[PDB]
């Protein structure tokens, strides 16, 4: 019956994100997406009464690393789009890890658990690109990057957030399964074409 299995099976939407991130030499992002996929897949499988026999760790661990992995995937995809060089890249990666870890651990269902990562990462991106536009005296990411990556990526991002945090009360089983697909598609689009620091 589809009602049970859809949130479990549709978590495999993140597997194309892992393979595409690996293929573009975004290995650290592919770890976070694969970690997320594993903990999101098992969070839904362990929650589902018809296949809860599959899970081995406590529900508390799977639920925490489902939410933490999801929020960290949103951070590392936006910091990949930002495309910082060293020593800022490792510093901004660690800033997300440490602040999202404490925030999610303090309260995993409270406000700021996803709008913290997105709100902060888009402010960091805006400040970098506004400096780069004043420097270049022209639209910094090419109209290609806006119309192919940033526009579609943030549209699938906005779709994922409004599916999960508005429409999900209509039917969880279908709307949460479309959230996995919309968010995985957002992570594919926001991630650049090549990891220029490693390829």
């Amino acid at each position: 019956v589809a009602k049970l299995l859809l949130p479990t099976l549709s978590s495999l939407a993140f597997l194309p994100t892992v393979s595409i991130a690996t293929k573009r030499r975004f290995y650290m992002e592919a770890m976070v997406y694969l970690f997320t996929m594993f903990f999101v897949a098992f969070s839904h499988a362990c929650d589902g009464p018809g296949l809860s026999v599959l899970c081995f760790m406590r529900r508390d661990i799977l639920e925490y690393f489902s939410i933490y992995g999801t929020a960290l995937s949103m951070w590392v995809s936006l910091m990949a789009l930002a495309d910082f060089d060293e020593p800022q890249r490792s510093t901004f990666t660690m800033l997300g890890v440490l602040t999202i870890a404490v925030r999610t651990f303090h309260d995993r269902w409270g406000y700021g658990v996803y709008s913290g990562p997105i709100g902060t990462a888009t402010l960091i991106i805006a400040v970098k690109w506004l400096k780069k536009m004043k420097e270049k005296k022209g639209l910094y990411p090419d109209k290609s990057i806006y119309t192919q990556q940033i526009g579609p990526g943030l549209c699938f991002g906005a779709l994922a957030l409004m599916l999960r945090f508005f429409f999900e009360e209509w039917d969880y089983t279908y709307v949460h399964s479309f959230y996995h697909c919309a968010l995985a598609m957002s992570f594919v689009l926001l991630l650049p074409k090549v990891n220029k620091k490693a390829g």
Partner: antibody, heavy 120, light 107 residues
Framework: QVTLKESGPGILQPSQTLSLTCSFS??????????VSWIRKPSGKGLEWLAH???????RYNPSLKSRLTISKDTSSNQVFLMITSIDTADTATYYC????????????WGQGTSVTVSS | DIQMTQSPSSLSASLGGKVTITCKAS??????IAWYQHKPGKGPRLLIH???TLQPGIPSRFSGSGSGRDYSFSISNLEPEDIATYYC?????????FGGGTKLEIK
């Protein structure tokens, strides 16, 4: 429609100074993100960039020539001026006036260029 | 300055054929390389911008590729109207530099 048209003296000698002018239409260069630039093709040689002037009256010059170029603007008549000082017979070229934009940062419209000669 | 060096200085070709020009930058120029077509007694035309983007109205036989110091430009289905001098432009910095130019010729 967009157009640029370069004009100048044609004949000079190395004691003298060069007063290049560039009339344009389709844009007025008071518009935000709009720019005009000067590029020159020396006699029997490839292109080299000289100078920029932007919408906000900001300016740039070639480090190799920075001392003896001054770029100016007049949007009252849609014109830009480049003044080149302390001339040498190395300045024998065609001088092009090219329009840059905000969305694509390279120049899109050029004029047909104007030739300058520097000999007795 | 950043040095832009086009590999063919001159390039002779058949009509209806295909050709490729390559250009090497002395630095990583972050895919900001425009390609221009110059004809005797005419102002140059912008054909391609960023690295691969054709200017609107330009025929789809012109194409360019590459990233990080190594960029390429190509004319397919080469017509006699494509016999011209082709320059690249590094435009990552507002210190603009052109490539040495490739004079295309009918063989």
């Amino acid at each position: 429609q967009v157009t640029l048209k370069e004009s100048g003296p044609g004949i000079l000698q190395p004691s003298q100074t060069l007063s290049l002018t560039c009339s344009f239409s389709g844009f007025s260069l008071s518009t935000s993100g709009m720019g005009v630039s000067w590029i020159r093709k020396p006699s029997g040689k490839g292109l080299e960039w000289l100078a920029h002037i932007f919408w906000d009256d900001d300016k740039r010059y070639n480090p190799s020539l920075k001392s003896r170029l001054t770029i100016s603007k007049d949007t009252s008549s849609n014109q830009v001026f480049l003044m080149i000082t302390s001339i040498d017979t190395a300045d024998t070229a065609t001088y092009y006036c090219a329009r840059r934009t905000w969305l694509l940062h390279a120049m899109d419209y050029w004029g047909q260029g104007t030739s300058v000669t520097v000999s007795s | 300055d950043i040095q832009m060096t086009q590999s063919p200085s001159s390039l002779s070709a058949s009509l209806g054929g295909k050709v490729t020009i390559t250009c090497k930058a002395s630095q990583d120029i972050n895919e900001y390389i425009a390609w221009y077509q110059h004809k005797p007694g005419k102002g140059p035309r912008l054909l391609i911008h960023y690295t691969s983007t054709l200017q609107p109205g330009i025929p789809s036989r012109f194409s360019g590729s590459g990233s990080g110091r190594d960029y390429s430009f190509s004319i397919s289905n080469l017509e006699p109207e494509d016999i011209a001098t082709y320059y690249c432009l590094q435009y990552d910095n507002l210190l603009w530099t052109f490539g040495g130019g490739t004079k295309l010729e009918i063989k």
